[PDB]
Ligand binder design. Structure first.
Ligand SMILES: O=C(O)c1ccc(Nc2nccc(Nc3ccccc3Br)n2)cc1
Length: 264
């Protein structure tokens, strides 16, 4: 119908962003838990984003996928916009990558299947350029993976070491280089995710922004010796200066190494 803040109990902040925080929450009657994104909107003015958000939340409102975090509804009071969100109990793949220090091919190829499916759904719905770096990826009920994306970056207090300057590691050469982008943007990311999954760090990591840029644009990246070659093939194919040379999501999902180690 139409919600307002008084319909919700508020728990801890799950993450705190620059435009506001995501809080643990539950609808008061059903006692059903969700996540409430809170956007200050005075900060939105400056950043220049209001009305273009107010169309999105509609474009996102229509999106139904198991691997995408569902936006239930949205409202506003005076000074805040509220996104009513699905709760992902297990948090960020980023905390996890910190925990285990790296993943294996079963975990990886499985997540990658999950992502590829979201992106492909998104594409069929004419939605491109999701932010799939690990901090925006969440973990649902059992193992499952969920693209959050959407609102502007929230973190969970931790670590605090690599923060932003986590920036362009996942950015494709065409995006960085001040050019437009087709749907192909997202397969570059896919390739960077996979690498980080197995390696524990992204392929272009460097102490200076310009050097990171160097390797990205020049597609300069190596592998540690433990990376299976089917991984190598997939990543190598995924990361190409030319968007054209990059796969459609099909052959990604069809990829030998994927099919092998993918639990889904
Ligand atoms: O820290 C934790 O234990 C923790 C973090 C997140 C969650 N669940 C959740 N659900 C829906 C949205 C959302 N936003 C979000 C919050 C922080 C970072 C990134 C995102 Br994107 N977070 C649960 C526990």
């Amino acid at each position: 119908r139409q919600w307002a803040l008084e319909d919700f109990e508020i728990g801890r902040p799950l993450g705190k962003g620059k435009f506001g925080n995501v809080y643990l929450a539950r609808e008061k009657q059903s006692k059903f838990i969700l996540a409430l994104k809170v956007l200050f909107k005075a900060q939105l003015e400056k950043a220049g984003v209001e009305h273009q958000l107010r169309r999105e939340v509609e474009i996102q409102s229509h999106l139904r996928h198991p691997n995408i975090l569902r936006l239930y509804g949205y409202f506003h009071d005076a000074t805040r916009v509220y996104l009513i969100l699905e709760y992902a109990p297990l948090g960020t793949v980023y905390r996890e990558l910190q925990k285990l220090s790296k993943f294996d091919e079963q975990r990886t190829a499985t997540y990658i299947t999950e992502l590829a499916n979201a992106l492909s759904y998104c594409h069929s719905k004419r939605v491109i350029h999701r932010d799939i770096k690990p901090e925006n990826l969440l973990l649902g009920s059992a193992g499952e993976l969920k693209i959050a994306d959407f609102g502007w970056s929230v973190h969970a207090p931790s670590s605090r070491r690599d923060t932003l300057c986590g920036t362009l590691d996942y950015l494709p050469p065409e995006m960085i280089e001040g050019r437009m982008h087709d749907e192909k943007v997202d397969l570059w990311s896919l390739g960077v995710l996979c690498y980080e999954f197995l390696v524990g760090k992204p392929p272009f990591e460097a102490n200076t922004y310009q050097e990171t840029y160097k390797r990205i644009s020049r597609v300069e990246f190596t592998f540690p010796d433990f990376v299976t070659e089917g991984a190598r093939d997939l990543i190598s194919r995924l990361l190409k200066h030319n968007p054209s040379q990059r796969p459609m999501l099909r052959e990604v999902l069809e990829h030998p190494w994927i099919t092998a180690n993918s639990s889904k």
